[PDB]
Amino acid sequence: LYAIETDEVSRLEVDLEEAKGQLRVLEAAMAKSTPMTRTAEFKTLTKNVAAVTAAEKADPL
Amino acid sequence: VKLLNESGVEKLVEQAGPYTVFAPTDDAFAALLEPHSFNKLATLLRPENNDALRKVLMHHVIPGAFTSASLMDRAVTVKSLAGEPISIMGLNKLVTAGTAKVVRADVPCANGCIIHAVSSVIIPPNYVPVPQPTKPVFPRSVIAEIAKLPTPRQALGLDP
Amino acid sequence: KAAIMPHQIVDGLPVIPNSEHPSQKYNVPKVSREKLQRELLIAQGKANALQIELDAAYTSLASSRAFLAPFAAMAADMDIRPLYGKNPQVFAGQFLGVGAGQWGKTGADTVRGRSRRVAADIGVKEFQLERVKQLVVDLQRALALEDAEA
Amino acid sequence: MQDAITSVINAADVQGKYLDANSVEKLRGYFQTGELRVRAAATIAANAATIIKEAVAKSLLYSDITRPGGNMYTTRRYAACIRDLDYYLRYATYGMLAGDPSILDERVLNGLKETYNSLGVPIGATIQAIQAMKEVTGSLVGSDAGKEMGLYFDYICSGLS
Amino acid sequence: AYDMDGTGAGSLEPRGIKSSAVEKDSRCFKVTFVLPSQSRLYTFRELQNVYTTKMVPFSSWYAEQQRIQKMGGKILKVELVAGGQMRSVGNQ
Amino acid sequence: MLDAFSRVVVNSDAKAAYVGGSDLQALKSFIADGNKRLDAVNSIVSNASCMVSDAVSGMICENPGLISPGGNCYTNRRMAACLRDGEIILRYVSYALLAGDASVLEDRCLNGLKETYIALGVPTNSSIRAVSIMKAQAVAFITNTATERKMSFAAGDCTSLASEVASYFDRVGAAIS
Amino acid sequence: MLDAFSRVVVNSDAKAAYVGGSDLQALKSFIADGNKRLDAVNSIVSNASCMVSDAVSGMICENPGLISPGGNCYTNRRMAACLRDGEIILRYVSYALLAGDASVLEDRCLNGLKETYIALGVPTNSSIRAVSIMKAQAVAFITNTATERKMSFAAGDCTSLASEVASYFDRVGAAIS
Amino acid sequence: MLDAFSRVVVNSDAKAAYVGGSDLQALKSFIADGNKRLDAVNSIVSNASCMVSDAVSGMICENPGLISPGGNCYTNRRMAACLRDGEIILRYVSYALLAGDASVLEDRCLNGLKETYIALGVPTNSSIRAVSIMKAQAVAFITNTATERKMSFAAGDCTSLASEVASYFDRVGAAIS
Amino acid sequence: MLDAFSRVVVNSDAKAAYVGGSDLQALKSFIADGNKRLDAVNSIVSNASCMVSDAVSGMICENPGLISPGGNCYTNRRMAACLRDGEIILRYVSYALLAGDASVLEDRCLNGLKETYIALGVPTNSSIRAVSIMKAQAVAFITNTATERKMSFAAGDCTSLASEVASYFDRVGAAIS
Amino acid sequence: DVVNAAYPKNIKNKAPVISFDGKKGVKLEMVTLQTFAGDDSEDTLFDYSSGKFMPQKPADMGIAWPSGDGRQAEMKGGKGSFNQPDLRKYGPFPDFLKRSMDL
Ligand SMILES: C=CC1=C(C)[C@@H](Cc2[nH]c(/C=C3N=C(/C=C4/NC(=O)[C@H](C)[C@H]4CC)C(C)=C/3CCC(=O)O)c(CCC(=O)O)c2C)NC1=O
Ligand SMILES: C=CC1=C(C)[C@@H](Cc2[nH]c(/C=C3N=C(/C=C4\NC(=O)[C@H](C)[C@H]4CC)C(C)=C\3CCC(=O)O)c(CCC(=O)O)c2C)NC1=O
Ligand SMILES: C=CC1=C(C)[C@@H](Cc2[nH]c(/C=C3N=C(/C=C4\NC(=O)[C@H](C)[C@H]4CC)C(C)=C\3CCC(=O)O)c(CCC(=O)O)c2C)NC1=O
Ligand SMILES: C=CC1=C(C)[C@@H](Cc2[nH]c(/C=C3N=C(/C=C4\NC(=O)[C@H](C)[C@H]4CC)C(C)=C\3CCC(=O)O)c(CCC(=O)O)c2C)NC1=O
Ligand SMILES: C=CC1=C(C)[C@@H](Cc2[nH]c(/C=C3N=C(/C=C4\NC(=O)[C@H](C)[C@H]4CC)C(C)=C\3CCC(=O)O)c(CCC(=O)O)c2C)NC1=O
Ligand SMILES: C=CC1=C(C)[C@@H](Cc2[nH]c(/C=C3N=C(/C=C4\NC(=O)[C@H](C)[C@H]4CC)C(C)=C\3CCC(=O)O)c(CCC(=O)O)c2C)NC1=O
Ligand SMILES: C=CC1=C(C)[C@@H](Cc2[nH]c(/C=C3N=C(/C=C4\NC(=O)[C@H](C)[C@H]4CC)C(C)=C\3CCC(=O)O)c(CCC(=O)O)c2C)NC1=O
Ligand SMILES: C=CC1=C(C)[C@@H](Cc2[nH]c(/C=C3N=C(/C=C4\NC(=O)[C@H](C)[C@H]4CC)C(C)=C\3CCC(=O)O)c(CCC(=O)O)c2C)NC1=O
Numbered sequence A: 001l002y003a004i005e006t007d008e009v010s011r012l013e014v015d016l017e018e019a020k021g022q023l024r025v026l027e028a029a030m031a032k033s034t035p036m037t038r039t040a041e042f043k044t045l046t047k048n049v050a051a052v053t054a055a056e057k058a059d060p061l
Numbered sequence B: 001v002k003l004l005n006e007s008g009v010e011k012l013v014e015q016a017g018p019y020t021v022f023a024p025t026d027d028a029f030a031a032l033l034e035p036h037s038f039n040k041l042a043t044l045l046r047p048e049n050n051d052a053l054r055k056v057l058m059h060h061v062i063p064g065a066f067t068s069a070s071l072m073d074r075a076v077t078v079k080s081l082a083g084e085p086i087s088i089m090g091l092n093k094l095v096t097a098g099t100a101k102v103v104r105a106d107v108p109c110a111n112g113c114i115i116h117a118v119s120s121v122i123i124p125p126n127y128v129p130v131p132q133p134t135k136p137v138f139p140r141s142v143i144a145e146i147a148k149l150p151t152p153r154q155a156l157g158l159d160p
Numbered sequence C: 001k002a003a004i005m006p007h008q009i010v011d012g013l014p015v016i017p018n019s020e021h022p023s024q025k026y027n028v029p030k031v032s033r034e035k036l037q038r039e040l041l042i043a044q045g046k047a048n049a050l051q052i053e054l055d056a057a058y059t060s061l062a063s064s065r066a067f068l069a070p071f072a073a074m075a076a077d078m079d080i081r082p083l084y085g086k087n088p089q090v091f092a093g094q095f096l097g098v099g100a101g102q103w104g105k106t107g108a109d110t111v112r113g114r115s116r117r118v119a120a121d122i123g124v125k126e127f128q129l130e131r132v133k134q135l136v137v138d139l140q141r142a143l144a145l146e147d148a149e150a
Numbered sequence D: 001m002q003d004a005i006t007s008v009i010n011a012a013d014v015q016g017k018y019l020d021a022n023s024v025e026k027l028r029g030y031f032q033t034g035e036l037r038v039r040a041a042a043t044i045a046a047n048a049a050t051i052i053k054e055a056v057a058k059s060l061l062y063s064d065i066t067r068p069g070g071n072m073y074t075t076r077r078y079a080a081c082i083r084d085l086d087y088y089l090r091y092a093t094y095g096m097l098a099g100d101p102s103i104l105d106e107r108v109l110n111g112l113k114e115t116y117n118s119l120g121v122p123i124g125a126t127i128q129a130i131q132a133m134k135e136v137t138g139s140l141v142g143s144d145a146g147k148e149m150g151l152y153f154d155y156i157c158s159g160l161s
Numbered sequence E: 001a002y003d004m005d006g007t008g009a010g011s012l013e014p015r016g017i018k019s020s021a022v023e024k025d026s027r028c029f030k031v032t033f034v035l036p037s038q039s040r041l042y043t044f045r046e047l048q049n050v051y052t053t054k055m056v057p058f059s060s061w062y063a064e065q066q067r068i069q070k071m072g073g074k075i076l077k078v079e080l081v082a083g084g085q086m087r088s089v090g091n092q
Numbered sequence F, G, H, I: 001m002l003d004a005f006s007r008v009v010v011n012s013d014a015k016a017a018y019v020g021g022s023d024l025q026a027l028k029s030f031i032a033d034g035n036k037r038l039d040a041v042n043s044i045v046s047n048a049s050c051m052v053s054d055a056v057s058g059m060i061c062e063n064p065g066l067i068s069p070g071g072n073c074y075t076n077r078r079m080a081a082c083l084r085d086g087e088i089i090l091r092y093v094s095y096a097l098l099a100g101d102a103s104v105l106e107d108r109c110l111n112g113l114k115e116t117y118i119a120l121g122v123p124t125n126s127s128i129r130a131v132s133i134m135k136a137q138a139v140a141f142i143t144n145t146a147t148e149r150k151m152s153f154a155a156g157d158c159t160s161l162a163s164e165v166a167s168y169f170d171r172v173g174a175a176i177s
Numbered sequence J: 001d002v003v004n005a006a007y008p009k010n011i012k013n014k015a016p017v018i019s020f021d022g023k024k025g026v027k028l029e030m031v032t033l034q035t036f037a038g039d040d041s042e043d044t045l046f047d048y049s050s051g052k053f054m055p056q057k058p059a060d061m062g063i064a065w066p067s068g069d070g071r072q073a074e075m076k077g078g079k080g081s082f083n084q085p086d087l088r089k090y091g092p093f094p095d096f097l098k099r100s101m102d103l
């Protein structure tokens, strides 16, 4: 009965379905583009940036 | 944040206690032009009625850190720092705070506090709107009021 | 029908040397009619917000007296006899009266207490309201001459 | 932690140049007021307890922060105030002698407004206490010395705001 | 007991850090700061990290915060993680 | 000016009606309680010098800025013209208590009083908490509950005269607000 | 809505009654006509549930191709969104009438609105008709010259408040043209 | 649907535990106040027909654009449907106060009601008013402080049941917002 | 009797001129087609606020860059000053229509205006665009060929006065060019 | 600039307001008819501040502290004689972060 917190593969597949369930409500809300105002809500830093990713890349114009 | 700074409530939510703020986006404040809600809230626009403004803003602060994940099909109430109970209501991933209908899930803050974006402004339950400023009226005569009081001989039915 | 504006009474009164707030009748700059209307409505708005924090000071004075009124009347029928100061047969030293500069600028500033301390808050808050209520008078009065000569 | 002489030497040193006429011009201006600052710091040391007793009784003695529920109710909380107001009157004395407010933000201002918000200390009543404390300090040291000591009080009030 | 017995100026124990902490206080901060030593170049001791973030109690935050600036430290952030605010009884 | 009986005539003149029989039932109970009204204005006029000195010097206890330099009760010409004005207000309140109707207070005293006090530089907020000390003094003298002076009356109940003179005193503070 | 004036704070522990350093001078001076302004916003938002249904159906009966199949208001998702955009515009006009400046109108409502409607295929020449009905509707309420609804007010004048709110409605209509 | 018993079942099913002695005290106290809850529903059902006419007409006298032509309370079918959904909402709240859990309120009453009121073109701002007038009546009937009908109840307290039905009407008003 | 109009005009201060019965028929005999001409200026000034709020807004409806940040019908004091200037030219046309000459319109209202609008940075092509709208309205109101309104007049022809009001509006645009 | 002497102090007086009040005379008035005004300027003619004032805080000098190291934000006074320039640059810094020249 406790094998949904203690298992090593039910822990992935539960957290896959909640993260896909959070993705499906976020992808549908990103079908609304032009007069939508922007709030930088400052999401967290649980996963660090693996790439360098400088803000100025080049002149691609 | 501007209403907090003017009203002096912002000192209260400066504190380190674990709070769960239900700060409404200004579209919620822009949505205060209901024909209905403008009755009970327009009177606060007057500059002397800061008194109720603290009591209406302090209903949005909840002692404790209630994240939306902590509201998995759970209905728990609590009173604000205003002093009156509010029912937080998370079912079908639709977390409610009175008449909130929360927009953004949570924002992690400094002292383990949480910030949820709501769609409207929660008015406290037993909040009566302040009346508009009126005219102190005085009775013009005194004989229209002695004639307005029933005599003892009237109360016993001795007279009409 | 028409109330007399308070700047038209100031023109009738003879001039005193000392005001609390001396007038800027001659010290208003020659600006246009539209900048006089903006500077009047700003000074009327600052006087409205200064009124409703002076009223919050009066409710704090009324709350400070109710805080101490069970003890203010409970010490009113005690026998409080001092050691000196009343009859001249006892050595009182500096408290024959008060000694050497310690009477103060007013006399009420040497009295301690919760209701005397919120009262000094009232007198500094009513000074700022009366200063800006006399500033809307000569802003209005120039308005009379902005229009009367117009 | 720099005085007027330390700040003058730093700016003249940070460009690698000697003390020219402009750098010594301010230094002479500081030495002229050297006699005023010591006597100002003299009387403030004498009437330290009297000044703080005058400020709290004139600003926040009887307000409802003093009553129950207010921010200053319990005796530990009241005693923390006069301990707390002592630093403002003391560190302002240091700025008045050093002629430079660098010591204030170095040792007072940093983490101060962020600390009062943690404790829930009312910044509004705090500044008015310092303003009232600035008002009595101009009584003792005189006008211009009060202008000097007063110049660092509102520096605390500005940053603490 | 607590640090406010009556000690002030002119008292037998030396004039020192006086904290407004109650009997056995249970409030503690979460502070963050850098504190360069400014003494290693004539002592030549080993080096230790100066950027620390730790929980200091309310009983001794003021002494620590008063000392962190003594040696030129800068306090980046402090919070009251454990304890209440405006709480008359219960800080014990 | 009007009194209590001229007030009921100008209501009856508005409909061109005679003062009949049903509205004489209330006028006969006004004159039946007319001896309590004369017994009430006698408890104000007898105490009237100490009423405006308990009030003006109690206004100073809540505002030390009046007796600071530049203040409104500062110099001797200015304290004398405030002790003058405090007993003019007590004079016209006792006229309307005697006349039964507040018409002599509203046009001979309270009309134009606010913008009079702007022009001289009088603080109108200090006048409101000065005439509210006299309001509490008068209702202690009507109902014989002052602590330092008791007067000798017959037995009964004068609470309706207490809240009629209380309404003449918050009619003053509505005019200088 | 509650940013559109200035409250004053009087209690302690506020850090705006003492250290705040400013009364809002441009917003203390807007309660100087503020009883006239609050009645004017009360005329609109007590009729805004009738104003948006009259204006949207005004352009349907003046242009019947919008409820044609293939028209932009045929489906029930589109008919609900056209009623929602009229109310949201009418609220932000009622912000700018209340606040006295059109900064809040051109920031939240009008910024990026012409680029929205030509991306969605919304006809702009018919949409300005629906705003200009509400321009003609709102001046009838504020001057109280509406036909089938009058409202009780205090006696006076309300021109240059109907003329102020006519200056916001074309400002909407030129930003979307 | 669920109730106050089966809410702590499916909460104890999530932890895969038995309903032990630490959770029966949430239920044995609920049944010990079972007579108070049945006396609390009976204040609502006995005034259920006059509360809905009290509340929909109070929506009309605050928002008079609903009875104007082009509104949403205009015709007799539209008025009787607005008297229907005032009491259909009141039917499910009185189930949800009786059951002790808001599952019946969030699966039958609120089962896409926001999607209905958009697609019907019902103004959602006025239906927040019509729900919340019934909230302000139900906390006056349960606490027996209605101003014009007192029911005879045994003395005690109902601040818990008044605050429970105030959280069911806000949960309706949160979801149709 | 025409001097008593101009004595109110040229006296460099404020006045009025109430015209009575026996003075009226001397004016109607003096003014040629006076019963048409007194209907001609009545068809303008009874629709004065409707004609301004088209003509200021129709300038913005064709030139939308004026209410852009940086335009001149931004910053609401400037937007209200354009509407007062549009109201002044509409009035001073109608006095020239009443008096039958463009002389009083030229010296009081129109001389020095070309130097005024280039001293304030007023875009002078849009002011000709604004008065061409008011030129288009006043020929329609006089001829009773207005669109949403029609006026109840005595029947006849007023094309000669409609050409006469065409000759006043272009003199404005010939001056501010 | 006030070039408006051509528009004198009888400026916006608005003579042609005409009210017929029936079939009778035209009743021409002289009403000025002001706008929805507001006259927007900053720094008006008086103070309008009665106490409650300590708002002033110095500018942020980056990560050092405010107003501490302004030795890079100064004019200059001296330079010296035997100073000789540098080869690498490593261009100019935010004030050598926290310690001053008198550390
Ligand atoms: C049976 C014969 C007979 C007449 C000839 C008239 C004579 C007459 N006409 C008018 C009606 C009038 N209406 C006008 C108006 C006019 N507008 C214009 O553009 C034209 C120039 C002019 C028409 C010629 C004039 C000038 C008079 C005459 C002056 C007058 O008495 O008012 C009036 C005034 C009362 C009224 O309006 O009826 C009288 C007594 N009446 C009669 O009963
Ligand atoms: C809390 C909400 C709130 C409101 C709704 C208003 C309500 C309101 N309006 C006015 C008072 C007034 N209101 C109006 C407005 C109007 N009169 C008309 O004939 C026009 C049609 C209409 C403008 C659209 C006028 C002209 C006055 C008189 C005072 C004045 O002109 O400043 C007053 C003062 C009453 C008095 O002292 O006489 C109040 C309380 N104020 C508030 O605080
Ligand atoms: C030192 C500071 C100082 C004060 C704070 C006041 C004290 C004071 N006294 C009264 C109140 C009063 N003052 C009087 C006056 C008198 N009593 C008598 O018996 C005499 C005949 C007469 C003086 C000649 C009376 C009758 C009351 C009413 C209280 C009572 O005794 O019942 C009030 C009114 C309360 C209110 O605001 O509503 C106040 C504030 N006076 C001061 O001096
Ligand atoms: C020339 C001056 C002059 C006066 C001063 C009064 C004097 C006066 N007072 C009362 C008589 C009275 N006075 C009062 C009044 C009061 N009693 C109280 O307990 C209250 C403290 C106070 C209310 C104000 C009462 C209750 C009576 C007796 C009942 C009554 O007369 O109606 C009476 C008796 C009338 C009667 O009994 O028929 C008289 C003559 N009349 C005058 O002609
Ligand atoms: C804060 C300001 C603010 C606004 C002004 C509106 C603006 C706006 N309208 C629409 C979206 C829309 N707006 C309309 C409205 C209309 N089309 C017409 O033909 C009529 C002329 C007009 C009604 C009067 C329609 C029909 C859609 C839906 C378009 C579609 O889905 O095809 C959208 C896209 C997202 C949505 O579906 O809502 C936005 C952002 N929303 C806002 O948040
Ligand atoms: C062919 C279809 C058609 C319609 C649906 C209506 C809709 C409609 N009404 C008005 C015009 C108006 N509409 C209103 C609105 C209202 N009046 C009230 O009493 C209510 C409170 C509220 C409607 C619920 C007002 C006040 C006016 C101004 C004219 C008037 O006073 O009636 C206009 C603008 C007309 C103009 O500006 O000249 C339109 C298109 N008219 C039509 O021609
Ligand atoms: C499951 C729960 C449940 C409800 C809550 C109700 C609510 C409800 N009302 C209507 C239908 C309606 N509902 C309203 C109601 C209102 N319009 C207003 O202006 C007011 C704000 C509000 C009344 C208070 C009106 C006016 C209609 C008529 C629409 C029509 O006839 O097409 C409909 C569509 C039904 C139909 O027309 O076929 C529904 C589902 N019925 C339910 O089964
Ligand atoms: C302008 C129009 C208008 C109305 C029609 C009434 C309607 C109305 N009544 C109440 C408030 C209430 N309404 C009722 C309803 C009723 N009383 C009963 O005993 C019956 C069951 C039922 C009438 C048949 C009750 C019980 C209260 C609580 C207070 C009380 O009456 O004791 C409220 C909520 C409080 C408020 O916002 O005012 C409203 C809007 N009020 C208005 O402002």
Ligand SMILES: C=CC1=C(C)[C@@H](Cc2[nH]c(/C=C3N=C(/C=C4\NC(=O)[C@H](C)[C@H]4CC)C(C)=C\3CCC(=O)O)c(CCC(=O)O)c2C)NC1=O
Pocket (backbone or CB within 6 Å): H032, H033, H035, H036, H038, H039, H040, H042, H142, H143, H144, H153, H154, H155, H156, H157, H158, H161
């Ligand atoms: C079949 C239908 C049915 C009912 C209608 C109720 C009837 C009911 N109510 C109560 C009993 C009660 N009801 C209340 C409730 C209240 N009292 C107040 O003063 C408040 C206004 C109100 C709160 C909502 C209280 C306080 C008691 C007594 C204490 C208790 O039972 O817990 C009791 C127990 C005491 C008794 O025997 O009367 C019963 C049977 N039960 C039922 O089975």
Ligand SMILES: C=CC1=C(C)[C@@H](Cc2[nH]c(/C=C3N=C(/C=C4\NC(=O)[C@H](C)[C@H]4CC)C(C)=C\3CCC(=O)O)c(CCC(=O)O)c2C)NC1=O
Pocket (backbone or CB within 6 Å): I056, I066, I072, I073, I077, I078, I079, I081, I082, I083, I085, I086, I088, I108, I109, I113, I116, I120, I122, I123, I124, I126, I127, I130, J002, J004, J007, J011, J012, J013, J014
């Ligand atoms: C009796 C005769 C009479 C007139 C003819 C007008 C002429 C006039 N216009 C303005 C003043 C103005 N006039 C305009 C007008 C416009 N700018 C535009 O973009 C539009 C094209 C146009 C309106 C449709 C503006 C915007 C100002 C104000 C300039 C400013 O404040 O920046 C001023 C004030 C100048 C000053 O104070 O120095 C005057 C006298 N007024 C009069 O009293």
Ligand SMILES: C=CC1=C(C)[C@@H](Cc2[nH]c(/C=C3N=C(/C=C4\NC(=O)[C@H](C)[C@H]4CC)C(C)=C\3CCC(=O)O)c(CCC(=O)O)c2C)NC1=O
Pocket (backbone or CB within 6 Å): G132, G170, I047, I048, I049, I050, I051, I053, I054, I055, I057, I058, I061, I132, I133, I136, I137, I138, I139, I140, I141, I145, I146, I147, I148, I149
């Ligand atoms: C007081 C009531 C009243 C009105 C509302 C107007 C209505 C009106 N507008 C115009 C005529 C016009 N009206 C406008 C105004 C506008 N057009 C637009 O593009 C926008 C929709 C709107 C600005 C918001 C314009 C631009 C013209 C045409 C002017 C021209 O010829 O260029 C005409 C002239 C037609 C004719 O004479 O036959 C009339 C009667 N007139 C009145 O007497």
Ligand SMILES: C=CC1=C(C)[C@@H](Cc2[nH]c(/C=C3N=C(/C=C4\NC(=O)[C@H](C)[C@H]4CC)C(C)=C\3CCC(=O)O)c(CCC(=O)O)c2C)NC1=O
Pocket (backbone or CB within 6 Å): I028, I033, I034, I035, I036, I037, I038, I039, I040, I042, I043, I142, I143, I144, I153, I154, I155, I156, I157, I158, J020, J022, J023, J024, J025
């Ligand atoms: C007291 C103030 C006063 C006025 C407001 C006017 C109004 C007016 N005009 C005419 C009479 C008239 N009015 C007009 C005018 C017009 N007819 C049209 O077809 C055009 C649309 C419109 C031109 C704008 C004409 C053509 C006549 C008839 C000829 C004339 O009398 O001049 C009449 C007489 C009608 C009758 O005999 O019953 C009156 C009262 N005259 C006044 O004395």
Ligand SMILES: CCC1=C(C)/C(=C/C2=NC(=C\c3[nH]c(/C=C4\NC(=O)[C@H](C)[C@H]4CC)c(C)c3CCC(=O)O)/C(CCC(=O)O)=C2C)NC1=O
Pocket (backbone or CB within 6 Å): C111, C112, C113, C114, D057, D061, D062, D063, D066, D067, D073, D074, D075, D078
């Ligand atoms: C709950 C614990 C607690 C205490 C004890 C407390 C005391 C306290 N005593 C005060 C004043 C005062 N206290 C006294 C007391 C005395 N005078 C004497 O002669 C006696 C020896 C003694 C009383 C028995 C006096 C005279 C003042 C006013 C001093 C002044 O006005 O300067 C004040 C300032 C005014 C006020 O806000 O009340 C406080 C806060 N606060 C607290 O929270």
Ligand SMILES: CCC1=C(C)/C(=C/C2=NC(=C\c3[nH]c(/C=C4\NC(=O)[C@H](C)[C@H]4CC)c(C)c3CCC(=O)O)/C(CCC(=O)O)=C2C)NC1=O
Pocket (backbone or CB within 6 Å): D065, D071, D072, D076, D077, D078, D080, D081, D082, D084, D085, D087, D107, D108, D109, D112, D115, D119, D121, D122, D123, D125, D126, D129, E018, E019, E020, E021, E058, E061, E062, E065, E066, E085, E086
């Ligand atoms: C040298 C620079 C410096 C300052 C300024 C400083 C302040 C400081 N003030 C404190 C508390 C406090 N400060 C106050 C002060 C006040 N209450 C009021 O109402 C007034 C507005 C105000 C007096 C002016 C109170 C009441 C506490 C106790 C708070 C508590 O027990 O929760 C504390 C908590 C620990 C302690 O006091 O022992 C610190 C560290 N520390 C420093 O290093």
